[PDB]
Design a protein around this ligand. Structure first.
Ligand SMILES: OC[C@H]1O[C@@H](O[C@@H]2[C@@H](O)[C@H](O)[C@@H](CO)O[C@H]2O)[C@H](O)[C@@H](O)[C@@H]1O
Ligand SMILES: OC[C@H]1O[C@@H](O[C@@H]2[C@@H](O)[C@H](O)[C@@H](CO)O[C@H]2O)[C@H](O)[C@@H](O)[C@@H]1O
Ligand SMILES: [Cl-]
Ligand SMILES: [Cl-]
Ligand SMILES: [Cl-]
Ligand SMILES: [Cl-]
Lengths: 416, 418
């Protein structure tokens, strides 16, 4: 009785049940049972690295694209060049999705692209209308973005449900990997980066002039009262919930919210809510050095201590392939990792998703480095402490620089 | 034909386990109970939005500390009939009974479902390698400090990680437990979260005794017993770090005993060294008393439900002996119904006996109208108090200043909504 075990993060409103629906046609063809376990994003790094060093865990795990090099360099993943060749090799993926299949500079791929995800701004159509904000100008530039938040702060608009005003902007300040992913575009927009390569060695560029200019611009949005104090102690899920509840006019997120907007509360969505009926999407605004957003998603890896590798490689080919690529993106509201799958009507004929599709031009990835998991832990801890400077009214350019100096020294040790 | 219930993640497979629990009720009455799972972090947001919007489930799980707050919004159906039918006041601990209502309210608006109290998990291997007598470490603040100090100085390394253990991990950010973990130290020094200054309830977090207890707790991080990284983490992540063998001691509820029995593939940690080297001990006595957090979750019926008689049948079922025993087995929680603690499955589990025989020290928050806003503000402000230690800025006067601001904020929340 052939059995496979898969670890996933919560990609859909009913994560286990949807994934069971996705693999149902593969279970039927092979007479295999695919058992699924769901790990919260917060604990996923801990549980996946523990499986890696202990030698016990699933056949397959979901991996964030930014983690693939890091888990690969622990030497615990199976080569999957065979699976990727069978899915159509380098040509079948965006160059950026292809780079997340391997540790940077490795002979062999160690992960199969599963779904893509990039970031854009959800806004309340009713709130921006009542505030006199033209979205096309609010989302064009840093100048316009600040100008829209300031109109939204001063607006008399109140939510038809809460009978309370809306925070112009909510973003997470603690615990989530997004504390890093929400800062990345502001950093890139000012011409900076998280890391840079000098003499073949990567190092922190979080304390570079350009990185500090973008981070400072982002944090100073909270300084001016556009992000409420309470938001800076919250994690991604809580900010999502506050947008859904109609407490926030604007927030950065992935294409999945479009799907949740169509599905009732009882099935893990917010179709009942005022926000679901007053939903707009806009790209990140251009910085001084132009337009960028975070491009990520999740791949699938096979642990090299798996006992079911030929069968697990069949599951990878199936999950990586057109039918399952379309189906899971429909269930999750993600984009397919397989580029050919973007032409399916559920993505092309989806108006809010169109913004996410167009935003792929300006999408940017972290290099796929060995220490990258420790970089995200240190960046999240130290960016958390940078939001604290605003909550304490201690935000200065020199206090940010000091903070990022400490982060950079730590990130330089982690990168080796 | 159908009922909708919102639950939090009470068991390793929340939806699937709850469906197995109600299967006998679905079959007896020819109805479908649809279940939705809300994370603890978002539960207050989603439940208050359903309340003020007037659309939502028939039944929702509520934390015991939320029942007054949701009740005061006027959206919950009276359930005196269901509680009478389950035995009346006599069938429940008087502390569980106080969580069925807003403080001083005519009617019950919630049905006790399951109880939860906090004790210390410890690594038996780690305290043995450190020369720590657990009965001494967990008896008093002095012994607690002296055990953490032997744990810091111990050369013991985890068989899996081959790295030391942090003597203590406690969550510093964005979970309700930032409050529930601080409360016993506050209580132990003779302080409290709130006090009534003649009718009007108010923050007592800035009282001399509350500041003494909180300072004792915070100063454990100051001395290096809590690693700085732990102070930016939430409950889920500290749980995960204990399971992964990174912490010698952590405060939590009885559910971890159950997770220690269940393999990784089903949402537990039975394969981990921590599961095989697991000890339990109550909170230590402070100068003024021995206390721990007593909470749990009740079930409420929204008054805008269209299926009230049927949903009252589900409450009688879930509140009654059969279901009370079964769901406590599935979750590793304790039954809310007093009579269910007797069941031999509960007096046969050594670690669970330590939680059970600790209940005498369980204490509850008063069941107040604005208690939801109090938890948000206490978590935010106590978060910022952990920050003072991580940034090396914790002094008597910096804590006082900080808790003065916490108290002002909490006083606004206790009189009106956020
Ligand atoms: O840094 C880890 C990975 O983060 C993923 O983004 C998820 C986001 O999709 C999700 O909504 C929140 C909820 O907490 O977790 C974030 O971490 C990215 O897709 C990956 O590229 C990245 O590797
Ligand atoms: O503060 C609101 C409610 O919190 C519940 O405790 C849960 C705990 O049981 C769970 O393991 C963690 C996961 O983060 O969240 C805590 O908040 C209490 O049991 C309730 O009494 C309380 O009302
Ligand atoms: Cl590129
Ligand atoms: Cl970068
Ligand atoms: Cl489940
Ligand atoms: Cl109290």
């Amino acid at each position: 009785q052939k059995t496979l075990e898969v670890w996933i993060m919560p990609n859909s409103p009913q994560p286990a049940e949807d994934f069971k629906a996705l693999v149902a046609p593969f279970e039927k063809a092979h007479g295999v049972e695919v058992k699924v376990t769901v790990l919260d994003w917060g604990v996923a790094w801990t549980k996946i690295t523990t499986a890696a060093t202990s030698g016990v865990g699933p056949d397959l795990t979901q991996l964030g694209t930014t983690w693939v090099g890091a888990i690969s360099a622990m030497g615990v993943l199976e080569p999957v060049d065979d699976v990727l060749e069978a899915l159509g090799g380098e040509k079948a993926y965006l160059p950026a999705v292809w780079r997340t299949t391997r540790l940077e500079g490795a002979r062999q791929a160690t992960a199969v692209p599963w779904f893509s995800e990039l970031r854009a701004f959800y806004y309340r159509t009713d709130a921006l209308k009542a505030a006199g904000v033209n979205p096309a100008e609010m989302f064009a530039s840093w100048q316009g973005f600040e100008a829209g938040l300031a109109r939204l702060k001063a607006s008399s608009f109140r939510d038809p449900e809460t009978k309370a005003p809306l925070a112009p902007l909510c973003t997470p300040g603690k615990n989530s990997w997004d504390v890093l992913h929400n800062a990345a575009p502001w950093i890139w927009g000012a011409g900076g980066e998280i890391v840079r390569q000098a003499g073949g060695r990567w190092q922190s560029a979080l304390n570079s002039p350009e990185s500090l200019e973008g981070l400072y611009f982002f944090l100073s949005l909270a300084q001016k009262g556009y992000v409420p104090a309470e938001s800076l102690e919250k994690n991604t899920a809580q900010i999502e919930a506050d947008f859904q509840a109609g407490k926030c006019a604007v927030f950065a997120s992935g294409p999945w919210m479009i799907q949740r907007a169509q599905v009732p509360e009882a099935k893990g969505g917010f179709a009942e809510r005022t926000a679901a009926k007053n939903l707009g999407v806009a790209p990140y605004p251009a910085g001084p050095k132009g337009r960028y957003t975070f491009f990520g998603g999740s791949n699938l890896a096979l642990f090299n201590f798996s006992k079911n590798k030929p069968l697990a490689k069949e599951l990878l080919k199936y999950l990586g392939g057109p039918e399952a690529q379309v189906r899971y993106a429909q269930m999750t509201g993600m984009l397919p990792a397989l580029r050919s799958a973007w032409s399916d009507p559920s993505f092309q004929q989806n108006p809010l998703l169109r913004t996410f599709i167009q935003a792929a031009q300006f999408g940017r990835t972290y290099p796929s480095l060995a220490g990258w998991g420790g970089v995200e832990n240190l960046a999240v801890q130290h960016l958390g402490m940078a939001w604290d400077l605003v909550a304490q009214g201690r935000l200065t350019r020199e206090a940010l620089k000091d903070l990022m100096d400490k982060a950079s020294a730590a990130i330089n040790q982690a990168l080796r």
